[PDB]
Design a binder for this molecule. Structure first.
Ligand SMILES: O[C@@H]1[C@@H](O)[C@H](O[C@@H]2CO[C@@H](O[C@@H]3CO[C@@H](O[C@@H]4CO[C@@H](O)[C@H](O)[C@H]4O)[C@H](O)[C@H]3O)[C@H](O)[C@H]2O)OC[C@H]1O
Ligand code: CA
Ligand code: K
Length: 303
């Protein structure tokens, strides 16, 4: 195995796909391996006010993301988390802005954008001092428990848990704060992973830098119910950001996901081959947040 570096150095692609006509952005990627291909769901925004979601047809290599058919979902699953819940042999798509704080649906065929079950409650809690409410869930399981982590655009990261045999189901209405900082330092888009070959878990969180540029900070833990330790936690020393991305097509390195070695709920990633599918936007872009022209990019860690 390969230890996480204390200084990350990446190289980047440019934008890997453009939104199909009618959408201004592709955002908040979730991605699994599927039958030897990449299966990606994403948030969309249209040219008016509508948040939506989509998947890409499975594609074999990252050059094929640009040509993969983009399939709209009839019922949106904004800021989605996709995984295979192996203990009950069912796929799960979790998301926000349905009927409760967080929702999920299930399927046996995650390539079908419109093949998901009816909406179920994932979380029904509220949080304090948040303009948005709970946002950007991520889920991960260990041997005995499933965990829900989320943010609130408020400087806090929250955790709920349930015995793994009780999942899929609702985590209830309460959560535990596991980290807090100034609003901009722990802002949104948390993602939690288990590192292959190591007794260690990795959390990355999106932050807002001094001039508004998005970047990620990282933290580690040795158990998912334990405490989190800063691993790379500033704009000049980030997990991934303009300081170290190798990207100039974007300054932002924002809401996305690490490439995983498995689709299942363990969220396992290979520390020897870390890659981040992120959302970025042209540095000249501006105006109202919801219309910003985000697109996917991929970072590959140098070792
Ligand atoms: O009922 C649902 C609505 O609540 C939901 O509203 C969206 C809620 O999320 C909003 O996106 C948040 C908003 O702002 C971004 O952060 C700002 C970035 O610029 C900074 O200068 C500023 O300080 C920050 O606050 C944050 O990144 C983003 O996640 C979105 O604007 C609302 O449209 O819409 C769906 C309904 O079903
Ligand atoms: Ca996410
Ligand atoms: K967002």
């Amino acid at each position: 195995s390969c230890e996480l570096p204390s200084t990350y150095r990446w190289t980047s692609t440019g934008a890997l796909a453009q939104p199909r006509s009618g959408w201004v952005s592709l955002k908040d990627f979730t991605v699994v391996p599927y039958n030897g291909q990449h299966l990606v769901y994403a948030t969309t925004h249209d040219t008016g006010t509508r948040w939506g979601s989509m998947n890409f047809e499975p594609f074999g290599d990252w050059s094929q993301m640009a040509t993969a058919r983009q399939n709209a979902m009839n019922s949106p699953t904004v800021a989605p988390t996709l995984f295979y819940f192996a203990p009950k042999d069912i796929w799960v798509l979790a998301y926000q802005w349905g009927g409760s704080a967080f929702s999920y649906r299930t399927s046996h065929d995650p390539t079908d954008p419109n093949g998901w079950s009816s909406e179920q409650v994932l979380f029904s809690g509220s949080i304090a001092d948040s303009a948005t409410g709970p946002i950007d869930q991520t889920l991960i399981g260990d041997d005995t428990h499933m965990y829900l982590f989320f943010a609130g655009d408020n400087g806090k990261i929250y955790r709920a848990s349930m015995p793994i045999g009780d999942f899929p189901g609702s985590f209830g209405s309460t959560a535990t704060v596991v980290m807090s900082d100034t609003r901009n330092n722990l802002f949104e888009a948390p993602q939690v992973y288990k590192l292959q070959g190591q007794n260690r878990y990795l959390m990355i969180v999106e932050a807002i830098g001094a001039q508004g540029q998005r970047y990620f900070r990282s933290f580690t833990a040795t158990s998912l119910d334990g405490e989190w330790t800063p691993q790379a936690t500033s704009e000049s020393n980030p997990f991934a950001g303009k300081a170290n991305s190798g990207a100039t097509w974007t300054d932002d390195i924002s809401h996305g996901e690490l490439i995983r070695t498995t689709a299942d709920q363990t969220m396992t990633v290979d520390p020897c081959n870390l890659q981040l599918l992120y959302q970025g936007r042209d540095p000249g872009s501006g105006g109202t947040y919801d219309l910003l022209p985000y697109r996917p990019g991929l970072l590959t860690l140098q070792r």
